[PDB]
């Protein structure tokens, strides 16, 4: 590669040396893509190597098999596993594709051409070339739209996707008539992120999922064609910084928001993250506790509408701050929960009293019992329960692992966005090295600060 | 010395042998620092690996037992021993190292030798600052960790019933000691402790903000994007812009430093004052002089059920800590509290 | 020529010549922070009792309601609300709004906005001054911690009642309940945070005492040592080489900081990265990841359980558990 | 030395040190008043 005297960047910033080296930059990117595909294949095969047919996938520390099963591979009615060969095929295809991408990354990193400008003008670029920057953005936008449409095709004609909201415990269903209504699609986007609305995390049906994917795929392809055939406007040119590190900073802020959103999706959403495969959410486990303690005490011959707590509020049933009937206890804070095991018992007034007394189902009762016994509560040792509990159960929820890891990654990537936004602005300005010591700006400003 | 003859002696030969440039400066203080510090550190590493706590506390605190780093400790001896010095030749052990280890003498060893190692290190700071002809502000700064160490590991157990109530040297044992001070002493509410907290958090603020301000107001000296190669050892100009730093913090925060000497003296002053205040508060707690209660708020809460505050919640939590930790932490009291009388809320 | 109203306002906002820099981040910061300051002071003085736990047990929290400086606190939002976004115009009356913990939510949202724009404004002043830009990156550590105790822990726990009360005794209560549920002391990220602030005090006293140890003589014993330093002077006021040789022959000659640049970089990076890690410690315990669980870790050959220091922590943790929210619980396991 | 005192010294307190003294004393009041009233 190079040394510090020919680049000015030390080894702890050695990748910065290849900011202007387009070929080595491309090789580092595709070698990284090989790493991502390699981890996906390696972890997927490791997970199917550590898979037990009896226990569900949330008890065994699985985070990729629930994704594949949500897509509708190897699962049937209720979420039991029919075969693991789709998971094995996914893992193997990922490993071999990672081998190919790693060959390419090693090739451009070691013996690939230094710069792609003098010989392959389609691929070589300078960072201040706004036309070709938008061209590459359009290529990648077309690729993203094609991926979104691949999910749409999978949901429409390639076996369907897993629905937890279908009757009988949920199953793999073929999506028919997705919600292409623009108001329904963008009301999620314009929605508030807070309780009761949850921004886009509160998408709660596969019709909305696949309709939103139709919209994102079509808009992404349209934006790709638009970016390939246009050049940025002067107001955008004035508004932006047009260096490679600036483009990196923009990407970092974007994927940081994406990581925080994925944290909230894993922690709250149960239709894109079906509770059979990922375990119960926090609200789900609390409502499950209150639900099964309702039905146990009903079967022990007690009244549920009566028997207020020590506070005079209602041990089993109270009213939410808007009026409809919700489960008693501190689980009132999770009154916003909506699951497939509460909806057949929930009507216009919230929890229906006669339906809750009479129309219990065995699968709902077992699901509530298990969503009590496997709550997203655990330690770093993977010891289940609260921090005061025994070392007897080996369980930490995949929801807990995903939410924690992706909040950490989202936070550092926001901080990396700060670092790169500041350094890109300072490098465009001439400040990346320090103050000039003879043209210091503060010395040209009046005193009194 | 001083235009006199002063014929040389064994003192002068030893002094010239000690005060010379080596890989490690030994000095006169190293006659104390090196053995006492080595014995304190090695005794801690020995106790965390082999020496048991089954007889002093009825716990497990060694790697040979199965404890890891976070959980192993060199345990304080039994309350029955009080403030005994636990000499290996003393009455409790009677010369016998093996049953000396299990009676808790290793805590007294580590505490006394650690105190003398700390004295040796501050004497080393004094000596090295004298030999290089620099002001002893490093030793003045180190006065605060020794103040904390003596008030916590010496004055507090001497004030209480015995060494048993000192902190055992180990991570989970320190956490026990901390939750003990919460439950029994309400050490959160103590004004001296919260002065220590303000001092330590302010010192961390000063450290971080001086580092960031210096690292972001540099002068160029460039022709290279690595700023770390723009520094030479021996020159006579400022490396970062003091005036730019003062302007920046004057317009961000409203007030800013403009004297480098006062800035660094403040960076010295904040943690020392914080740790000294914490030391004084722990000395108060050595005699059970707690800031446990607010008399007016307690009498108001006794004469009104409707009065509920976070302070009263803390008082209830402290009762819970004491009553749920006393039986297993204090075996000497033989506190067999039945499950009946323990404080407990609804459910849980 | 610059006569238009927007451009004149732009040059007023972006001006470095102000006593306090405003900038485009300050035009979001200043109203939000002033709103939060106003509501916080008014609530701290005269806020009626707040039903924090949702169990009709209102906590007073304010000075005029019989609290002192240590005990007064702006009480968190009701547990009945959860995370349901309670502003004034949602409430029927100001009385209802004050009962359900509305001032806490107002202060928290405005304060999160204010600190985010404070970090942005630090960057923007560093930009208009020709500075290097990463002081905002250093300030991202306390901002992350404030967001972790005011936003992320309530979001992961479902309720703004779980947020840190805006008080002193409320902060202590937040810690006791937090350790009860999560065992923060046995978390590596919190251990890193404690190491970060202990090393922050360590290195603050270290660097201050090394600079004060190597001060250069300009003044006399009449004048304070700071009087030897003149503002804006070009010469360095202390002997870096003397301090470096002191530290090297004090601990290790090679393992000192020969670059003052790298030394100040270390001073910046250590507590910032440790406060980052412990802020993520809170953030990961929001989604119930908790500290280490070493209870009944050691057993003997015959299966009996030996108590351990972690088990003493567990005993204190149980005491912190059962007493916290004594009436709010109706069911054994505290999943909510 | 002479009839007047040779060690005649002037004391100085800049406005910054006045500000530290006032913050210090008032912060001691804010901190300790709750405990003195108890």
């Amino acid at each position: 590669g190079r040394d510090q005297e020919t680049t000015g960047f030390a080894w702890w910033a050695g990748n910065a040396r290849l900011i202007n080296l387009s070929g080595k930059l491309l090789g580092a990117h595709v070698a990284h893509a090989g790493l991502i595909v390699f981890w996906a294949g390696a972890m997927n095969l490791f997970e199917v190597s550590h898979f037990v047919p009896e226990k569900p996938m949330y008890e065994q520390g699985l985070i990729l098999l629930p994704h594949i099963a949500t897509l509708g591979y190897g699962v049937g009615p209720g979420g039991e596993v029919l075969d693991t060969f789709p998971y094995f095929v996914s893992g193997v295809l990922h490993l071999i594709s990672s081998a190919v991408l790693g060959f390419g990354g090693v090739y451009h990193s070691l013996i690939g051409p230094e710069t792609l400008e003098e010989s392959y003008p389609f691929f070589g670029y300078v960072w201040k070339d706004k036309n070709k920057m938008t061209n590459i953005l359009g290529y990648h936008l077309i690729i993203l739209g094609c991926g979104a449409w691949l999910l749409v095709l999978k949901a429409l004609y390639f076996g369907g996707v897993y629905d937890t909201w279908a009757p009988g415990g949920g199953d793999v269903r073929i999506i028919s008539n997705p919600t292409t209504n623009a108001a329904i699609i963008f009301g999620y986007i314009v929605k508030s992120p807070f309780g009761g609305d949850g921004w886009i995390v509160s998408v709660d049906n596969l019709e909305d999922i696949i309709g939103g994917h139709i919209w994102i795929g079509t808009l992404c392809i349209l934006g790709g064609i638009w970016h390939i055939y246009t050049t940025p406007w002067p107001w955008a040119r004035r508004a932006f910084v047009w260096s490679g590190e600036a483009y990196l900073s923009y990407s970092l802020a974007a994927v940081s928001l994406m990581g925080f959103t994925a944290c909230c999706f894993a922690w709250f959403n149960n239709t894109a993250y079906p509770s059979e495969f990922y375990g119960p959410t926090g609200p789900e486990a609390s409502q499950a506790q209150a639900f099964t303690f309702l039905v146990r005490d009903q079967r022990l011959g007690a009244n549920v509408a009566s028997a207020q707590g020590p506070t005079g509020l209602g041990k089993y049933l109270m009213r939410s701050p808007t009026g409809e009937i919700i489960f008693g206890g501190e689980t009132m804070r999770f009154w916003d929960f909506r699951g497939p095991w509460v909806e057949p018992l929930r009507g216009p007034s919230g929890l229906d009293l006669v339906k809750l007394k009479n129309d219990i189902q065995p699968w709902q009762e077992r699901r509530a019992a298990e969503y009590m016994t496997h709550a997203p509560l655990g330690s770093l040792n993977s010891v289940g329960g609260v921090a005061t509990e025994i070392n007897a159960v080996n369980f930490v929820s995949p929801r807990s692992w995903l939410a924690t890891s992706h909040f950490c990654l989202g936070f550092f990537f926001f901080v990396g966005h700060l670092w790169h936004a500041g350094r890109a602005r300072a490098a465009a300005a001439g400040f990346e090295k320090g103050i000039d010591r003879v043209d210091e700006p503060v010395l040209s400003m009046r005193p009194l600060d | 010395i001083g235009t006199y003859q002063e014929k040389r002696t064994w003192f002068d030969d030893a002094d010239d042998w000690l005060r010379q440039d080596r890989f490690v400066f030994v000095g006169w203080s190293g006659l104390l620092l090196l053995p006492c510090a080595y014995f304190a550190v090695g005794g801690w590493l020995t106790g965390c690996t082999f020496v048991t706590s089954w007889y002093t506390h009825g716990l497990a605190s060694s790697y040979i037992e199965g404890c890891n780093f976070l959980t192993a400790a060199v345990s304080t001896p039994a309350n029955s021993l009080g403030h005994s010095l636990l000499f290996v030749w003393g009455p409790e052990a009677q010369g016998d190292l093996t049953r000396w280890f299990q009676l808790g003498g290793l805590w007294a060893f580590v505490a006394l030798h650690g105190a003398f190692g700390l004295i040796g290190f501050m004497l080393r700071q004094f000596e090295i600052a004298r030999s290089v002809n620099l002001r002893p502000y490093n030793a003045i700064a180190f006065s605060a960790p020794i103040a904390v160490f003596v008030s916590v590991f010496l004055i507090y157990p001497l004030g209480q019933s015995g060494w048993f109530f000192a902190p055992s040297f180990g991570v989970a044992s320190i956490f026990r000691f901390i939750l003990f001070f919460q439950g029994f002493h309400n050490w959160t509410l103590n004004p001296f402790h919260m002065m220590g907290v303000a001092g330590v958090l302010g010192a961390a603020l000063l450290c971080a903000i001086h580092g960031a301000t210096v690292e972001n107001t540099l002068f160029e000296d460039g022709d290279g994007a690595n700023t770390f190669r723009a520094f030479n050892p021996t020159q006579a100009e400022e490396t970062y812009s003091m005036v730019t730093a003062n302007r920046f913090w004057s317009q961000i925060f409203g007030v800013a430093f403009s004297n480098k000497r006062w800035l660094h003296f403040f960076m010295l002053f904040v943690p020392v004052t914080g740790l000294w205040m914490s030391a004084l508060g722990v000395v108060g707690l050595a005699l059970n002089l707690r800031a446990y209660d607010f008399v007016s708020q307690e009498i108001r809460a006794a004469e009104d059920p409707e009065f509920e505050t976070f302070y009263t919640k803390n008082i209830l939590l402290n009762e819970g800590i004491r009553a749920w930790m006393a039986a297993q932490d204090q075996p000497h009291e033989k506190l067999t509290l039945p499950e009946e009388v323990l404080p407990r809320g609804n459910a849980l | 020529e610059n006569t238009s109203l927007w451009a004149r306002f732009c040059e007023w906002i972006t001006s470095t010549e102000n006593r306090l820099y405003i900038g485009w981040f300050g035009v979001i910061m200043i109203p939000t922070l002033l709103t939060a300051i106003s509501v916080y002071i008014i609530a701290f003085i005269a806020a009626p009792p707040v039903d924090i736990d949702g169990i009709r047990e209102p906590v007073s929290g304010s000075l005029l309601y019989g609290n002192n400086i240590i005990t007064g606190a702006v009480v968190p939002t009701s547990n009945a609300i959860g995370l349901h976004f309670y502003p004034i115009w949602e409430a029927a009356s100001l009385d209802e709004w004050l009962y359900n913990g509305g001032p806490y939510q107002l202060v928290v949202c405005h304060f999160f906005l204010g600190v985010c724009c404070y970090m942005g404004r630090e960057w923007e002043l560093s930009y208009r001054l020709g500075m290097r830009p990463w002081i905002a990156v250093a300030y991202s550590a306390p901002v992350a911690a404030a967001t972790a105790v005011f936003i992320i822990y309530p979001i992961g726990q479902g309720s703004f009642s779980d947020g840190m009360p805006l008080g002193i005794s409320g902060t202590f209560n937040f810690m006791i309940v937090f350790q009860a549920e999560h065992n923060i002391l046995m978390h590596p990220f919190h251990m890193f945070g404690v190491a970060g602030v202990f090393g922050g005090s360590l290195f603050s006293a270290m660097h201050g005492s090394l600079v004060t140890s190597s001060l250069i003589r300009e003044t006399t014993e009449n004048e304070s040592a700071n009087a030897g330093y003149k503002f804006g002077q070009e010469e360095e006021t202390y002997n870096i080489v003397a301090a470096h040789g002191y530290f090297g022959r004090l601990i290790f000659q090679y393992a000192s900081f020969n670059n003052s640049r790298s030394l100040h970089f270390f001073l910046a990076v250590w507590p910032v990265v440790c406060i980052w890690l412990t802020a993520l410690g809170i953030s990961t315990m929001a989604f119930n990841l908790n500290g280490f669980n070493f209870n009944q870790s050691v057993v003997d050959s015959n299966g009996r359980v030996l108590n351990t220091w972690a088990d003493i922590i567990n005993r204190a943790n149980l005491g912190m558990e059962v007493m916290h929210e004594r009436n709010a619980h109706n069911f054994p396991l505290d999943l909510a | 030395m002479a009839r007047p005192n040779p060690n005649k010294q002037v004391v100085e307190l800049n406005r910054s040190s006045l500000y530290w003294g006032l913050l210090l004393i008032f912060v001691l009041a804010v901190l300790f008043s709750s405990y003195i009233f108890n």
Partner: peptide
């Protein structure tokens, strides 16, 4: 009677803060 004292002490600290921000000794470049 105590809330009077606490309020006075708090606004006194805030007043000293205000005076320290906007009424400091102006630093000089020389």
């Amino acid at each position: 009677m105590e809330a009077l004292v606490y309020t006075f002490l708090l606004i006194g600290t805030l007043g000293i803060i205000f005076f320290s921000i906007f009424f400091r000794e102006p630093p000089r470049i020389a």
